[PDB]
Structures are given as structure tokens and as C-alpha cells.
Amino acid sequence: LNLLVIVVDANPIWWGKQALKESQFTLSKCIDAVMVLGNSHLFMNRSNKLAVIASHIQESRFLYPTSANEVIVEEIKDLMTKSDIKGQHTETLLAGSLAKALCYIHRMNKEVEMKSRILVIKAAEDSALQYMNFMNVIFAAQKQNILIDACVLDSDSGLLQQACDITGGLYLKVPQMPSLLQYLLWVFLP
């Protein structure tokens, strides 16, 4: 049995700028690639479990849990049309989403051989204030022997490559965006 928890950096600021910069790559393409990868993970073995959490500026919401694709679409739609963005709190909170993922892997681990794994796709500036928190969620991931992988699209994260180095995960800095899925399916499919 394997576990795949995809953490997508749905930072509305960065994605909005990316749509304004008129690059071919928008948030919709990223979500479609994520859904394709998750479908492959679920198909490889009918033991596997899937989880997709969106990391927003305010909250971290489980997009999941094909019926799965439909529920993901509706969830992200609601999350992006019903929002409250305070000006002060504009960064993305990677640490909170990782914490939610960890506590989810807790119960799922309790259910049982579950080999857990978290994939993070980041795009925007990673906040430095969460140093006390983010480090915590790395070590909590280390003690549970959960791997943390990183597909970073644009901006570099010293924090996330730190976390990949600690947990024993993979850090991929993809250059051109239309070639993302190929990488996603290749190196990040358990």
C-alpha cells in the first residue's frame, strides 16, 4: 500500500500574476496535471489512497477526498470564488497545509503496510515567519518517516529543499511549464 498527498500551492497572488503575464501556464493547467497524476496513482494499485490539499493564503482546504476529478473541480471553484483576502496576510502558508496533511496521515496510518509520501508543488514566495512552524512540520514528517517531495515551478524555497533534504525527498526545479506533466508523471509517481 502507498499514500500520495499532493499539496498544491494555490497562492492566488502568484497565479493571478501568472495569468496576467499571459503565460500559457495557468492554475487550471496545473490542476489538470495534478488530477492526471493522482488518477495514475490510484490506478496503479487498487490499494492506493489519494489526498489533494490546496494551500491558500488564509486556509488549507482538502480538495480530495472520475468522481474524484469532479469533486476536486467543484472544491477549487468554491475556494477561489468565495474568499476573504486580508491585505496583511498575503503570503502562502506552506506549514499549515503540511500540518493538516500530517495529521491526516496519522489516522490513515492508524487504519491498517502504508508507505506515506507527500508531494508539494510550489510557485510563490514562501513565508519566512513560519520558521518555527515549518521546521516543526518537517520533524513531525521525519519521525513518522513520511517523505516530502518538491516540484517548484518558479521561485526557490530554501525551506522546502531543506525539508526535502531532511525527510529524504526529491527537489525538482522544472524550467518550462508546458513540459510539467511529463516530469510530474515520471519522477513523482510512487
Added chain:
Amino acid sequence: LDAFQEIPLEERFCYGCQGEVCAVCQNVFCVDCDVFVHDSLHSCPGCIH
């Protein structure tokens, strides 16, 4: 890390794992995550946000 408080029926779906309470952020937590936040993670998910 502070301890947490619980009452069964009044005002399920947890804030952490989203499966069916902090005195600071007022976030409903189930038993599993209530133990994991204290024993392992050493910080509350609602306190981070």
C-alpha cells in the same frame, strides 16, 4: 504547548484531518489529531493559520 478541551455533542468534522478544541483559535479537533498535535507535532494547525 497548551492542552486542549473537549465536549462531545455541542456545536465531528475536525479542522485538521476533516474527519467526523483549542482555547486560542477555537478549532474543533478529533481525538486522533488531538493526540498527534501534542505528542508529535508540538504546534497546533489552527495556530499556524
